[PDB]
A paper describes a structure:
determined the three-dimensional structures of these four agarases. initiated by GH86 or GH16B, which generates NAOS. depolymerized by GH86, and systematically saccharified by the exo-acting GH117B and GH2C enzymes. exo-acting β-d-galactosidases, while GH117A and GH117B are α-1,3-L-neoagarooligosaccharide hydrolases.
of the GAL residues in the −1 subsite. with the GAL residue in the −1 subsite was identical. classic CH–π interaction with the GAL residue in this subsite. pocket, at the base of which is a serine residue (S326). residue (T82) in the place of the phenylalanine residue (F77).
Residue numbers in the entry: 21 to 644
The structure:
């Protein structure tokens, strides 16, 4: 059994973040003004049900800007530039439409828009628009590559957006440069395999042009389709994200990636959830520290699962479950880094009827709504898909973060206190049910009530997701289902008193990315660590090694032996080509000091230590 402990009087502080951020986390890939809200739905006022009742935020949109780019006339004075007058005209037409759409204006308080360009025709590779012209491909001193694309983007933002309501749509919170560019440039079938670093320079040019027209706008990149750092023995890291940080890092306000699990690609299960995405995110942060001297805010503008083996099938509840389980796990992991995550958006769109292909009968694979007669036919009014269960599960969750601990790296836990209510969230990374023994410490009173919410799969493969919601007189034990999530809601007679603090600080090494040779000591240094009287600590070993190679180095911390656990967060990565993941190693707090030496010795040759980082948890008093 796994012991899960909730210390509800102990605030968990990370940087200056102490509270659950619903807009940052409980959101989806939509806008308040898409016309799909307003027709063909069983629920008459769908915004009120989805946005208001469930308290769900938006969003991200690429289609409006694409339509303007693809239809704008060319500047007669400057070949390869959008005409400023026609651009203003098209933007004005759209702005007028927004201004007249008064029913959506009260929902602006739920919206912080991520704007982004689709790859084509924004990337200036010669692709022509519907008006028969291509964005300038020049790369001169006065017209660096992407100048015309950048000017288009900057002018679009300036011309279309207003200050809310009758003044126009509020400005975006964040401007991503370009969606999944290296997928199109390098990796897709029949990709041209043009210059990778040219794309990175393009980001600097775009940022400068956007900020010429819109000085306060945050710009980011590179919006990576598949951040797969270990590939080609870390050659992929060295050619891509390393270079992007080196070239454009100083010019970006935020970094942005996409994170998709592959639960079923030609019958293989290749997950990021668990230790793999920890390694990806640690490598971005660690190298940012080395090169830039700071961690850059990270956006995850799309995440969950891509379901290859089900993507030529019609809709099913099971396909939605594949997405749900990835979303819940990834979300917990992003919550653990809330101080350095600026936005994380599960990839679920509202309706995307544009994505329905009448040739094949295939609807879009990530929708909040589906037609009543699906999967048999794409007919009938729209009703919620199973993805609504995510928003049902997370309903109400807010408040001050408090300390949890669970003694199984495959179980993730978190908790938030909102007055009299406490939300205790537990997620399973294991592929079997896990029996939990629950302890709630820090109050003298029993809860007045307990509501259990449990999201799991019934009936195995091709089964259905179930959201069980029930009241419990007590909850000392609970079986969490395979890859399942529960949210346990405790309600107390009076407001819960939070009277202690646990402050988490994450420290980075002076170096990274070291090759492993058998019996050869690798030495890392983590310095200026601040200790208090009482604390705990975790060393985070990012390892990228072929299968068959040891994940159990000899570890010395300040000359003292520290044991490495057999179990780490998530799966052993069997169907992946190699192992890439962070092994989390608890370390006795008394071994640590301000300047620390971490030594690793492996028994075999090959692979790399990608990163060594450390989390310190400092307590206000002797809370253990
Ligand atoms: O990298 C593996 C690929 O497998 C293919 O079977 C799949 O079609 C392909 O999907 C693509 O993935 C991202 C890049 O472009 C979109 C497309 O669906 C998506 O954003 C990819 O998964
Ligand atoms: O494919 C054209 C449509 O794309 C929609 O947005 C998509 C694209 O960017 C976000 C979202 O998903 C990605 O995979 C991209 O393909 C857009 O909303 C529509 O109006 C069309 O442009
Ligand atoms: Ca990409
Ligand atoms: Ca990559
Ligand atoms: Ca494990």
């Amino acid at each position: 059994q796994t012991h899960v402990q909730l210390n509800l009087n102990v605030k968990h502080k990370l940087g200056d973040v102490t509270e659950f951020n619903r807009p940052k986390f409980i959101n989806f890939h939509a806008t308040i003004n898409e016309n799909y809200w307003d027709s063909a739905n069983k629920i008459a006022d769908l915004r009120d049900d989805l946005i208001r009742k469930y308290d769900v935020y938006v969003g991200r949109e690429t289609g409006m800007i694409k339509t303007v780019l693809r239809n704008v006339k060319e500047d007669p004075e400057r070949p390869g530039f959008a005409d400023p007058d026609d651009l203003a005209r098209l933007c004005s037409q759209n702005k007028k439409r927004y201004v007249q759409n008064t029913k959506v204006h009260p929902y602006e308080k739920y919206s912080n828009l991520i704007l982004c360009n689709q790859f084509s025709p924004f990337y200036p590779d010669g692709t022509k628009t519907l008006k028969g012209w291509a964005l300038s491909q020049k790369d001169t001193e006065d017209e660096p590559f992407g100048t015309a694309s950048g000017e288009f983007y900057g002018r679009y933002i300036k011309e279309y957006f207003g200050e809310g309501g009758e003044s126009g749509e509020p400005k975006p919170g964040f401007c991503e440069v370009i969606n999944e560019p290296l997928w199109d440039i390098y990796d897709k079938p029949k990709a041209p395999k043009s210059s990778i670093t040219k794309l990175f320079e393009f980001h600097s040019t775009i940022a400068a042009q956007v900020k010429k027209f819109n000085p306060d706008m945050k710009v980011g990149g590179y919006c990576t389709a598949f951040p797969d750092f270990e590939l080609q023995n870390f050659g992929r890291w060295n050619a891509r994200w390393k270079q992007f940080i080196d070239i454009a890092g100083k010019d970006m306000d935020f970094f942005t990636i996409h994170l998709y699990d592959f639960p079923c690609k030609d019958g293989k299960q290749m997950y990021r959830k668990g230790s793999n995405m920890e390694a990806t995110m640690d490598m971005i942060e660690q190298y940012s520290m080395i090169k830039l001297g700071e961690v850059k805010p990270l956006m995850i503008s799309e995440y969950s699962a891509q379901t290859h083996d089900y993507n030529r099938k019609p809709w099913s509840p099971y396909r939605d479950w594949l997405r749900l389980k990835s979303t819940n796990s990834m979300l917990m992991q992003f919550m653990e880094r809330t101080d350095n995550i600026c936005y994380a958006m599960p990839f679920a769109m509202l309706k995307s009827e544009w994505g329905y292909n009448p040739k094949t009968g295939l609807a879009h694979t990530a929708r909040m709504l589906r037609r009543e007669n699906e999967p048999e036919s794409f007919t009938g009014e729209y009703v919620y898909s199973e993805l609504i269960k995510f928003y049902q599960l997370w309903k109400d969750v807010k408040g001050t973060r408090v300390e949890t601990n669970c003694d199984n790296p495959d179980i993730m836990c978190d908790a938030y206190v909102d007055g009299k209510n406490v939300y205790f969230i537990i997620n399973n990374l294991d592929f079997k049910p896990v029996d939990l023994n629950l302890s709630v410490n820090g109050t003298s009173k029993d809860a007045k009530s307990i509501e259990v919410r449990h999201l799991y799969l019934k009936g195995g493969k091709d089964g259905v997701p179930i959201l069980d919601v029930y009241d419990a007189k007590s909850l000392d034990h609970f079986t969490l289902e395979t890859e399942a999530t529960c949210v346990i809601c405790y309600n107390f007679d009076r407001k819960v008193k939070i009277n202690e603090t646990m402050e988490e600080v994450k420290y980075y090494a002076t170096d990274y990315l070291k090759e492993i040779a058998a019996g050869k000591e690798l030495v890392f240094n983590i310095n200026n660590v601040k200790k208090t009287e009482y604390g705990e600590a975790v060393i985070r070993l990012g390892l990228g090694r072929n299968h068959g190679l040891s994940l159990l180095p000899e570890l010395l911390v300040n000359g003292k032996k520290v044991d490495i656990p057999d179990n780490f967060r998530g799966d052993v990565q069997k169907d992946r080509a190699s192992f890439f993941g962070v092994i989390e190693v608890p370390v006795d707090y008394s071994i640590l000091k301000g300047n620390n030496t971490i030594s690793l010795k492996f028994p075999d040759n090959g692979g790399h230590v990608s990163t060594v980082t450390m989390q310190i948890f400092n307590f206000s008093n002797n809370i253990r």
